[PDB]
C-alpha cells in the first residue's frame, strides 16, 4: 500500500536518492553455446560494470543461463526439455558456454503421469571419461498391449526391479564410455531412451521412456583449451 492511511512504520526514516542510473552504468554481453547445438548465439546478459574487470569476469564466471532445446536447435518438438548452460570463459563481449544440466518442464511431467499404469524411476550416479561426476534420472511408464482388455497395465515388483536394473546398467555403460560433449551429443536426439526401450522390450512393454534429468556434481580442473576447441588471438586498433 502507498495509501495515506497506511501508517508510517519505523520504516520510512531515511531513504536514498535515485541518482545512480543503473542501466546506464551497466553493460551488455552476448553469450554463445557449444558446438553440439545448432543455434549457438542465444540472448544477452548484463554485467554490473567494467571498472572492476574483477567484477566483469567474476560475474560472468558465476553466471548460468537456462534455455530450451527448441530455441537452441530450431525444432519445436524439443519443447519440453530444457538445458542449463554455464559460462566460464569470457572474451571480447562474447561468452563461451558449456553444458551444465538438463530437465523437463513441469507441464510435461504432469502430462505424462496418468492413472492406470505404473511409474518406474531409475537413478544412477556415474562419472564420465572427462571426470565430470554426473547424476541421471530416467523414468518410464508401463504401457499396454495392442489387444489389452484389462483396464490397467501394472507391472509386478519383480518386473519393476528388473527394468530398474537394466536402465541403471544401460545409463552407466553409456555415460562411462562417453565424454561430456559426447554425452550431450547423445542426449540431444533421444538415443539413450531408444536404447532403454530396445533393451526392455522383452520384460514388459513400456512407453514414454525419457531421461528425465541430468545433474552436474563435480567438475575437473578447468581447461580453457578444451573450451575453445569445444566451441570451435586478436589485436587492437592503435589508440594514441
Amino acid at each position: 500500500a502507498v495509501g495515506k492511511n497506511k501508517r508510517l512504520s519505523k520504516g520510512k526514516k531515511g531513504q536514498k536518492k535515485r541518482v545512480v542510473d543503473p542501466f546506464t552504468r551497466k553493460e551488455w554481453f552476448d553469450i554463445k553455446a557449444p558446438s553440439t547445438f545448432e543455434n549457438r548465439n542465444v540472448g544477452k546478459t548484463l554485467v554490473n560494470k567494467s571498472t572492476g574487470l574483477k567484477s566483469a569476469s567474476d560475474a560472468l564466471k558465476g553466471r548460468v543461463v537456462e534455455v530450451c532445446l527448441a530455441d537452441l536447435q530450431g525444432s519445436e518438438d524439443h519443447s519440453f526439455r530444457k538445458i542449463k548452460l554455464r559460462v566460464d570463459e569470457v572474451q571480447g563481449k562474447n561468452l563461451l558456454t558449456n553444458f551444465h544440466g538438463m530437465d523437463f518442464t513441469t507441464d510435461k511431467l504432469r502430462s505424462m503421469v496418468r492413472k492406470w499404469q505404473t511409474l518406474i524411476e531409475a537413478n544412477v550416479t556415474v562419472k564420465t571419461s572427462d571426470d565430470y561426476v554426473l547424476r541421471i534420472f530416467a523414468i518410464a511408464f508401463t504401457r499396454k498391449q495392442a489387444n489389452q482388455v484389462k483396464r490397467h497395465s501394472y507391472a509386478q515388483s519383480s518386473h519393476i526391479r528388473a527394468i530398474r536394473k537394466v536402465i541403471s546398467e544401460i545409463l552407466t555403460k553409456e555415460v562411462q564410455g562417453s565424454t561430456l560433449a559426447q554425452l550431450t551429443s547423445k542426449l540431444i536426439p533421444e538415443v539413450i531412451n531408444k536404447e532403454i526401450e530396445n533393451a526392455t522390450k522383452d520384460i514388459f512393454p513400456l512407453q514414454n521412456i525419457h531421461v528425465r534429468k541430468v545433474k552436474l556434481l563435480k567438475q575437473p580442473k578447468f581447461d580453457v583449451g578444451a573450451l575453445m576447441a569445444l566451441h570451435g588471438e586478436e589485436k587492437g586498433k592503435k589508440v594514441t
Binding site: 548484463l46 560475474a59 548460468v64 513441469t106
Partner: protein, 127 residues
C-alpha cells in the same frame, strides 16, 4: 533480432510480484508489486493491481531495450497452494497486451515431493 528477458510472475495468495530479469536471472531489471501500485491492502492482490504493475514493468523493460520475454509464473508453492492465481493471470494478460513479445510460458511452482506439516492444524486452516 530481438532480446529476451524472463518475466517471473509470483502470484502470491494475497500479493503479486512481477519481476523481470535477464537470462540467468542474475541481473534484475524492474520489480513492482501489487499494493505498491494499489494504495490499500484489500486490493494489494487484485487483478487491477497486477494489471497496473505489469503495465509499468513493460514500460521499464522497453526502457532498457528488451522486447521479448519468456515467462515463469509461480504460486506460493510449498505446503501452501500450488497453482497460480487470478493475480498472475491478470499480470500475464496485461503484459501480453502491452506488446512485449511473449516467448515461452512455464509454471515453475515449487511442488514438495514430501512436505512438512502445514500451518493449519488438524482441524483445518481456512474458516
Amino acid at each position: 533480432s530481438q532480446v529476451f528477458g524472463v518475466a517471473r510472475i509470483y502470484a502470491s495468495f494475497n500479493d503479486t510480484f512481477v519481476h523481470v530479469t535477464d537470462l540467468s536471472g542474475k541481473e534484475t531489471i524492474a520489480r513492482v508489486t501489487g499494493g505498491m501500485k494499489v494504495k490499500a491492502d484489500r486490493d494489494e492482490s487484485s487483478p487491477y493491481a497486477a494489471m497496473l504493475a505489469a503495465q509499468d514493468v513493460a514500460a521499464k523493460c522497453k526502457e532498457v531495450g528488451i522486447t521479448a520475454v519468456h515467462v515463469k509464473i509461480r504460486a506460493t508453492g510449498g505446503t501452501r497452494t500450488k497453482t497460480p492465481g487470478p493475480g498472475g493471470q491478470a499480470a500475464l494478460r496485461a503484459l501480453a497486451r502491452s506488446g512485449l513479445r511473449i516467448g515461452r510460458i512455464e509454471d515453475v511452482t515449487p511442488v514438495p515431493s514430501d512436505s512438512t506439516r502445514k500451518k493449519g492444524g488438524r482441524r483445518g486452516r481456512r474458516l
